[PDB]
Structure formats: C-alpha cells, structure tokens
Design a protein around this ligand. Structure first.
Ligand code: CA
Ligand code: CA
Ligand code: CA
Ligand code: CA
Lengths: 5, 413
C-alpha cells in the first residue's frame, strides 16, 4: 500500500 | 538492479499534516520502504537532498530495512518535529530499450554453467552451445554464469573458455564476459599499450561514451592497471589532440538542462563560426571548450544554428579547418553528438566494406552496443546502405564466429 505523512 | 550511496538527510514536520512524504513498500513485499511523493511545502527544503526513489534504511539510527510497512510508519508517527533519515537511491541502472540482446526469462545460472561445462568437456568443444547461450544472455546474467561456473568447477570461466575457444570467436565470447566498464577499459589499454597508439579505437570509445559510462570506466581502469586513464592518455597523445581527448575522457559534460537556452545556442553557434570558418586559422581551444562542456541536446541545436552562420556544416567545417588526429577526433565527436547510432552504423560499414575485415572494430561495436542502441544502429544501417547489418556480417564472416555476431545483431534488417 501507500501511507502518507 | 542498483543501490545508491547512503546519505543522511534531516527533515521537519509540518503543522498541517506531517513530514510531507508519502512512503510505500515493506518487508512483506521483499522491497524496501521508499518515499513515493514529496509535498510542495517540503519540496523546496529537500531539493537535492531527498528525491522520490530514496529507500529509507535508517530512521534516527533505527534500522528499518527488514521492517514492515506499518512498522516504519509508526516510527515516523511517534517521532519528534525532526527526523534524520539515512537514505539510498534505488535506481534501475541495468537495461536499455534499444539493445538487441534481450534478457532470457527462464534464466538459471547454475544450469547454464553446467551446460557450458559439458560443452567445454565434449571432445572438439561444442562451441555452438557456448555461443547460443552467452550471446542470448544479458551482461548481468553472464556475470552470474561466471560465478556459478567457478562455484561448481573451482576454475575461472574466462580462462577455461580461452582454452576451449580460438580465433575471432574467442575474442567475441571473452569480450561479452567483461562488464561494460571492464571491456571499455581493456580496449583503451590496448590502444595505448606499446610504442604506438590506435587512435581510431581510442577516439571511438572516448567520443561515444557518456558521463555515467566514463565515470565507471575511469574507476575500473585505475583498479585493473593501477594507473589513471588520464595519465596514459597524456603519455600516448600530444598537442591539441591530447587536449580534446583528456577533456572528453573526464566525463564532466553538462547535464541537459530543463530549459532550451536559445541565447546560448545562438552564441555558441556564432562562436564556432568566428573561431574557424570566418577567420584565418582556427581557435582550437574555443572549439574544444564548446563541444566538450555543453550537453548533447544543446549541441545538437547549436550545430543546426551553426548552419545559419556558415555555408558548411560542422563536419565540413572541421575538415576545412583542422587535419590529422585532431580532425578525425572532432569528426567522430560531432557524429556521436548528432546521431550516435549512425556513427556506429558508419563504422560497421567501414569495417566490412573492403578486402577482409577490421575485426577489431566489428567485434567491439557488436559487443559494446548490443545492449545499448543496436536496434537504432540496425535501422539506419539498412536505411543508408540498402541492406541489413545482418547481411554484411553474413557476407564478411563465416563459421561459429559469424553465428555469434549475428546473435549480437539480433535479426535481419
Ligand atoms: Ca567442435
Ligand atoms: Ca604507446
Ligand atoms: Ca579558418
Ligand atoms: Ca569485407
């Protein structure tokens, strides 16, 4: 997946 | 397949949102955690320090390489307002879209090593099996076969193949076994070893290699021969020919900028005109400085703008201005800038057009360019000369040596 900060 | 050098970068957390970086990957997918997106706020702050593609291997000294995706997220979550990142750029250095040698999909280095070993062991040597394998494997795959051979036989693959192969076939196979930098460096030392110089080969390599290629060339040349390439070039050349070669061999040419500097394209074109055709004699350093330092896409437009100031193009002007090794050097350099595949198609035709074959040039172009731009070399060899590069190799060579070259060619037309 892809987490964002 | 390439992992860059490690770098330490300190970032900061925004009030709205967080650090402004999106990440993806993890130990679940057997891939590292990589920054995917950088926000416009932290874009200007991290310009040149962190880029999309950097693999975050350490966070504040904590090794997050063998960690999962959400495990790395929670470390960035529970951090302070700043985080020091140890990053390494993941790139894809191997590969080219215009090479004729395709990667073998069912690749197994242990099986290919055994099949070659049994081909060497067969009485009379089964060169056909060795050629059909090594010519249909990428260079990265060949290095794996060499490691698997020495693992199974306790003997080096290149030394055993020299004892099994002879003639021009041996030269082709042994050349495919060296890495591009190894092969280019070995061909450079051959052009300078002895009391003479093969300027045709020294010019072909230095004028056509790019910055990235020349960087690794200079590295392995010092590793294999314990001498910098610039020293041996200085010892084997002189005059302005030495100046042009030493400068080109640095690999410090400008990267192609994001803008088309029209003012510099016209000024460079007029500078080349005033430095040669317009005046008596030639300002050789001015020609050297412009054609060596500017980028290739810039010089392509410069040479077209030069046709606006001079009634002769850069090639014709070079012939009328300079002679000898300097003229030949400049002529090869402009060809590489204008149309490098056409440059190689022309050299391939010259290696086979007359009596016999200049095998030194035919082999090197087929080995060094099989995984770079051979498809483009072929499309213009056919276009200019009317017949295929396959056709000329077919008419000029025979035996298993012909079969290997036709494999590196990759097809008819
Ligand atoms: Ca045989
Ligand atoms: Ca010499
Ligand atoms: Ca002149
Ligand atoms: Ca011939």
């Amino acid at each position: 997946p892809e987490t964002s900060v | 397949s390439h992992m860059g050098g490690e770098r330490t970068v300190t970032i900061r957390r925004q009030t709205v949102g967080g650090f402004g970086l999106s990440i993806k990957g993890g130990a679940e997918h057997n891939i590292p955690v990589v920054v995917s997106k950088i926000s416009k706020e932290q874009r200007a702050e991290l310009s040149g320090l962190l880029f999309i593609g950097d693999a975050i291997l350490q966070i504040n000294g904590i090794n997050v390489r063998k960690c999962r995706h959400e495990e790395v997220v929670q470390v960035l979550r529970n951090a302070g307002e700043e985080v020091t990142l140890t990053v390494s750029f993941l790139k894809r250095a191997p590969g080219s879209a215009y090479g004729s040698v395709k990667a073998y999909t069912n690749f197994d280095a242990e099986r290919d090593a055994l099949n070659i070993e049994t081909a060497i062991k067969t009485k009379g040597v089964d060169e056909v099996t060795i050629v059909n394998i090594l010519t249909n494997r990428s260079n990265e795959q060949r290095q794996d076969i060499a490691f698997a051979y020495q693992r199974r036989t306790k003997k080096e693959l290149a030394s055993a193949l020299k004892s099994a192969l002879s003639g021009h076939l041996e030269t082709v196979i042994l050349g495919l076994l060296k890495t591009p930098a190894q092969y280019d460096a070995s061909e450079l030392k051959a052009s300078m070893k002895g009391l003479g110089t093969d300027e045709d080969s020294l010019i072909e390599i230095i004028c056509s290699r790019t910055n990235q290629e020349l960087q690794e060339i200079n590295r392995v040349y010092k590793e294999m021969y314990k001498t910098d390439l610039e020293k041996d070039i200085i010892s084997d050349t002189s005059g302005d020919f030495r100046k042009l070669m030493v400068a080109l061999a640095k690999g410090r040419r400008a990267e192609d900028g994001s803008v088309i500097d029209y003012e510099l394209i016209d000024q460079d074109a007029r500078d080349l005109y005033d430095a040669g055709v317009k005046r008596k004699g030639t300002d050789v350093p001015k020609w050297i400085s412009i054609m060596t330092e500017r980028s290739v896409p810039h010089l392509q437009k410069v040479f077209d703008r030069y046709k606006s100031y001079s009634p002769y193009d850069m090639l014709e002007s070079i012939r009328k201005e300079v002679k000898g090794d300097l003229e030949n050097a400049f002529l090869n350099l402009v060809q590489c800038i204008q149309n490098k595949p056409l440059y190689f198609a022309d050299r391939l035709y010259d290696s086979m057009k007359g009596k016999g074959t200049r095998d030194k040039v035919l082999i090197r172009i087929m080995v060094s360019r099989s995984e770079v731009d051979m498809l483009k070399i072929r499309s213009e060899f056919k276009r200019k000369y009317g017949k295929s590069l396959y056709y000329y190799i077919q008419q000029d060579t025979k035996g298993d040596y012909q079969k290997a070259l036709l494999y590196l060619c990759g097809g008819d037309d």
